[model samples]
Target: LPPGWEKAMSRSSGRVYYFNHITNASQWERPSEPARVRCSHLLVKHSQSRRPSSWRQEKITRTKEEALELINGYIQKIKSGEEDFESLASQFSDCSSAKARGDLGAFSRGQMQKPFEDASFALRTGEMSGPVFTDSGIHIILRTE
Candidate 1:
């Protein structure tokens, strides 16, 4: 095994999966080039989102403006240090990742949508991103690594 290689058996398929910590690659052989990044995000889905259902809400009914507004308020809480990312995400995010404190897991290029990937990649570790919009909804991203 390489320095970053961490092998584990997959519960879903009962097959072995190779994980690359540095490259975020999921392949049999080691990744040719090493690279990866990870981020946690708090998502607010609006009625206009591609999919309006969430674990928190059976059917999300907020409009984009309203959703974005709520995200803005959450951002203020984070900026002021009154609230942390994990708690707010678990309490309010529309995405399923909220259960894991908004953790999206490790991903390389082409894994996430354009707006999200760009924003996550640009921020340094421990940095937070403001409201970013995608077809899914609005998000406040936190670069965890």
Candidate 2:
């Protein structure tokens, strides 16, 4: 299936790209073990939202284009006999999980971000998500459904 997108006044086949940076925070509440929370996440989708025909000419990039390119490259790497979810995430992911080799462990619908939830839920096990661009960056999600 194709990606979904929403903008001010247009729609298209593939999701727009985004570049994101996240920070983790350890919170200590009086007397409990520190709870690790996502302290911050920076999303940059507006940077590379060229309307296909204008991408190259616009010269607008902050990671969205790179992400789309990376995801597209990843789709080429998919095969039947060998499927390593962690490996793919590590090499292609820009998420904090990239450090964890892209292990976005089991999660419920709303646990993950909106863009992530949409892509993850849309695909079947072992099927690669269409190149999805969001405010954070381009995400090429491989569903483990």
Candidate 3:
């Protein structure tokens, strides 16, 4: 293994990734404890949601552009200290997590789709990311731990 490559696994899928420290790459081979990622999100979906099981169909009403605009507002509020991350998630998220204040709980690399997984693991603790687009929707993420 390379010096920075650490072994990480997706408990949900039993997939593996060699997560690199320097390049921040998640791959399918060796070196190994999966870093547990915990975060909260506010989702605004396009007309069709990729993960229909997680999202409320009624909330999947925005076009991609509209969702981006909406998520940006939440990003601004969180950055300005005007709104709390969990509260916004509870109120606006299309995901089932809306009920849990958008908490996705702890997960490892490869458990989520590539785009969402990349964005989630790239964040530093307490950092709030701008809207991250995935097949599911646009998400405003807050890395809590």
Candidate 4:
């Protein structure tokens, strides 16, 4: 175990894997892929990303650095479960299910922009992604099945 990582063994390959509760994502000695992503982001508590959710579409006066730091703190907050995903998403997020607990419902690929879709596909159920961008915006996504 690596401090925060959870180790497990697979019955199929009998291999070891790890899971990060905060990130909600898992890493296999193999692969961690998913379908029909249920996304929830922590935008800014402040509004910020593919996040193609429009936060970036507005008057983005601040640079990426400022936003990144804010998102980072939110990620840590989420890790400890200090806040609810939906509550956190509503409080911080500015798009895509930003209101429904950041729960973007469930959608297939090609539905949500480009990077956002790929970002979701790249994660497994309950996987936590700190920052997801589509060139201009940055949205935090949690792929919870």
Residue 96 of candidate 3: its Cα lDDT? 81
Cα RMSD, each candidate: 15.1, 14.8, 11.1, 8.0
**Cα lDDT tens digits for candidate 4, 45-120:** 2233223234434544555677777776776777788875667777666554565777767888878768667667
Better of 2 and 4 by lDDT: 4
Error of 2 at 94 (Å): 2.0
| lDDT per model vs. reference | 0.81, 0.44, 0.72, 0.62
TM-score ranking, best first: 1, 3, 4, 2
Question: Model 3: per-residue lDDT, tens digit, 1-145?
Answer: 7444578778988987666553244445563333888988788888756754344554455677887788778877876889888998898788888999999998898787776776677766675565677888888777778
Identify the candidate with maximal TM-score.
1
Better of 2 and 3 by TM-score: 3
Candidate 1 lDDT tens digits, 9-80: 888888887764433334444332226888999999999999999998899999999997899899889878
Q: Lowest summed lDDT over 10 consecutive residues: which window, candidate 4?
A: 45-54
What's model 3's lDDT at 18? 68
- Per-residue error at 105 for model 1, in Å? 1.0
Highest lDDT: give the candidate number: 1
Per-residue lDDT tens digits for candidate 2, residues 5-106, read 222221363443321221111111211111121211112233544332122224444455565565555655654435454666655444556655655667
> Which of candidates 1 and 4 is the stronger one according to lDDT?
1
The TM-score, computed over Cα atoms with residue i paired to residue i, of candidate 4 is 0.61
